[PDB]
Each structure stands twice: as structure tokens, then as C-alpha cells.
Amino acid sequence: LLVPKLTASVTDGAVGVTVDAPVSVTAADGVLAAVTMVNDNGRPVAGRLSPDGLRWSTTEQLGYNRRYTLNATALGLGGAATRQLTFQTSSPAHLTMPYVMPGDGEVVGVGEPVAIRFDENIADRGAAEKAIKITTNPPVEGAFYWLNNREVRWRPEHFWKPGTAVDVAVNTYGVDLGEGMFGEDNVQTHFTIGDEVIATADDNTKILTVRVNGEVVKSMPTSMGKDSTPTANGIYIVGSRYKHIIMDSSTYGVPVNSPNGYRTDVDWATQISYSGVFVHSAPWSVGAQGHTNTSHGCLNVSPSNAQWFYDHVKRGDIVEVVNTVGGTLPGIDGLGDWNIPWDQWRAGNAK
Ligand SMILES: OC[C@H]1O[C@@H](O)[C@H](O)[C@@H](O)[C@@H]1O
Ligand SMILES: N[C@@H](CCC(=O)O)C(=O)O
């Protein structure tokens, strides 16, 4: 009695069809007897019909800047219906690829933020935030904050609880991130929080004390930045580690040949700020470690203590510096996120 009906997720003649979602077709009062989608070159798009014959959907990534033609026929006891629909997908001016840290499957410390760094400036930060889905278990409140025009961070109010699972789905493919810039692809990463490791460098004592789940496990004499190039106070996130590295002040904005410049090969170096602070082996200053500050800002320790730090501290662990004559590490350093007050971080800066 009733003629079958076709309903597609696109309209014939549409332009700017976004490719963040599959294209589908549904039949009512009948079943789908044939569904094909081809691009402007005639090549078919992969799809799948549901077992009950009522719903077809694309099953592969749809492309930017394509003209697709969908042909569908529904058949029912009451007759047949055929439709042909042609539509154009989004045509980006630019593409941007996101890069996520930390790495997939990593175990990181209680200070590790989620980091999503785009390779282009993001004109619509809110669109980017909306496209990033963070799952936590146990669930905890967190929020986004932009360090610069390309990199956004997500973290909770307080250091993570050990044993928390964190899942990051950056679903930017087909999403307009402003001014015609679209996501180059999706990215999906997962990590876990390990032991709580917090090392405190107190300028009053010139000791760097490492605590693991609240217990003191190591007490390292240190020499921090001299009064003219002091170590900033505050909370530092542990970054990369190196068995050896050439520390080149030009990497951190300071000409080597300038008064505060340097180019030094050091062993057992753990990065704790993008501004170039490391914990590292300093055989030349062992006499001053635990007594006086001599460095350009780095936390000088002994060879054995630097190796110990390399072996026992991981990305996302915390170093807190207190009581120096320096200022406070900038919240937007790169590893300084925890120095931003929570009310300010939570409010964000997407606008
Ligand atoms: O996503 C984590 C972010 O926190 C920063 O401390 C480090 O650069 C990486 O671990 C990353 O950029
Ligand atoms: N490092 C160089 C200058 C580097 C730079 O300007 O980036 C020098 O002092 O010799």
C-alpha cells in the first residue's frame, strides 16, 4: 500500500558538507536494494548496509574538496523509489595536523598535562577544544588552557591521582578550526598516571629532596643559579631525559658568546623547563653543591645523583623550587602549567 521512502544525511545540491561524519541513507516502508556513492572521478566509496536492509553508511574517510554522487533505490511491497543526490564537501584553505603528548601507552607522573600542539595557528580555539574529548578514570574535572596560538593543555585542578587512565581523542578531521583551516586527521592517544614523585629544591638548604608517594628516598646536594642568573621558584614538570646532551644557550634565546651564554656537554640531564633548566651532572661544581649557587639556572648535582634522577624520575614527575632569589617560573613556559592559578586556568583563554 505505501511507497517506500528514502532519507539521506545529505541534500542534493549541498555544498560545504563536512567530512567529520559518515554519509548515510535510510529506507522506510521498504528496504535498500541498491546504494552506491562515487566521487567526481567515478570511483566508488566504501560503505555498508545494515543486515535489516534499512540503513547504509560510508565506512571510510570522506575527502575534502570532492563532489560525490549518491544513488539509492528502496523497494517495498508497495513499490519502489530511487533518488540521486550530488553534493560537495568542505574545501579547506589550510590544513593543520595535531600532535599529542604524552605518548600512547606511556606511564607518566602526576604533573603531566594533556598536550595538543597544532602545526598551524588556530583561529577558533573553541572549535578545537570542542573537538578534543578527554576521558579520565577515575573521572576528574579538568580544563583547557592555551600556552600560545598553537598548543593547548588540559589538566585537573590538582596533581593527578596515581593509577588514573587518561584517553585523548583529537577529532579534528572535517572540523573547521577557523578561517578555513581544517583538521588534517584525527589523533587518538592513551596514557596512565604512575607513582607520585615530587622533588623539592630548597635554596635555604641547597638540597634537592626526592619524595616517592610521600616518602623521602633521595637527598641531593645541589648548586642552582647564581644571583645574576637565578633559578626561578615554582612548579616544574619533568620533560625529556638524556644520557648526555650539548646544552646550547642559543636554543633558549641567549647567544653563546654573550655574557650569560654557554655551550656545554653534560651527562645525565633531565629537562624541567622549556627555558632550559635541567637537573644534570656537574662534576665541576661538586664542591659548591649543598653550599653555594654557581650555575646559569640549572640544578647542578653530582654524577651519581644525576644518573639516579635519570633512572628514577619520569616524564610528568614534579620538581618544586622554593626560596631562591628568582621570580616564579612562567605558567606558559611549556613545563610551567601548574603555576597558573586554577581559577585562571579553568576560565581558559579560548576567546
Ligand atoms: O602533554 C604533556 C605536555 O606536558 C609538557 O610537560 C611536556 O612538553 C610534554 O609531556 C607535553 O608537551
Ligand atoms: N649563539 C650565537 C648566537 C645565536 C642566536 O642568536 O640565536 C652566539 O652567541 O654566538
Residue numbers in the entry: 57 to 407
Please quote the authors directly:
Among the five L,D-transpeptidase paralogs of M.tb, LdtMt2 plays an important role since an M.tb strain lacking the gene encoding this enzyme exhibits attenuation in virulence and exhibits enhanced susceptibility to β-lactam antibiotics. The L,D-transpeptidase class in M.tb is comprised of at least four substructural domains including two immunoglobulin-like domains (IgD1 and IgD2), a YkuD domain, and a C-terminal subdomain (CTSD). The YkuD domain has a highly conserved motif HXX14-17[S/T]HGChN containing three residues analogous to the catalytic triad of cysteine proteases: a cysteine, a histidine and a third residue (Cysteine 354, Histidine 336, and Serine 337 in LdtMt2) to catalyse the transpeptidation reaction. Based on our structural, biophysical, and biochemical data, we identify a new PG disaccharide moiety-binding pocket (named as S-pocket) at a distance of 21 Å from the catalytic site in LdtMt2.
The crystal structure of LdtMt2 was solved at 1.57 Å resolution. This high-resolution crystal structure is an improvement of our previous efforts that enabled us to identify an electron density in a pocket between the IgD2-YkuD domains, and a glucose molecule could be modelled into the electron density at 1.0 sigma. The sugar molecule is ensconced at the IgD2-YkuD domain interface in a pocket, which we referred to as the S-pocket, making several electrostatic interactions with residues R209, E207, E168, R371, Y330, and A171. Three residues M157, A171, and L391 stabilize the sugar through hydrophobic interactions. Superposition of the structures of the LdtMt2–sugar complex with the LdtBS–PG complex suggests that longer nascent PG chains thread across the S-pocket in between the IgD1-YkuD domains of LdtMt2. Based on the structural details of PG binding in LdtBS and LdtMt2, a PG chain was computationally placed over a positively charged surface across the IgD2-YkuD domain interface encompassing the S-pocket. This computational modelling of a longer PG chain spatially aligns one of its tetrapeptide stem across an inner cavity of the catalytic site in YkuD domain in LdtMt2, similar to reports of carbapenem and a PG-moiety binding in the same position. Based on our crystal structure and modelling study, we propose that the S-pocket anchors the disaccharide moiety of one of the nascent PG chains prior to transpeptidation of tetrapeptide stems in the catalytic site.
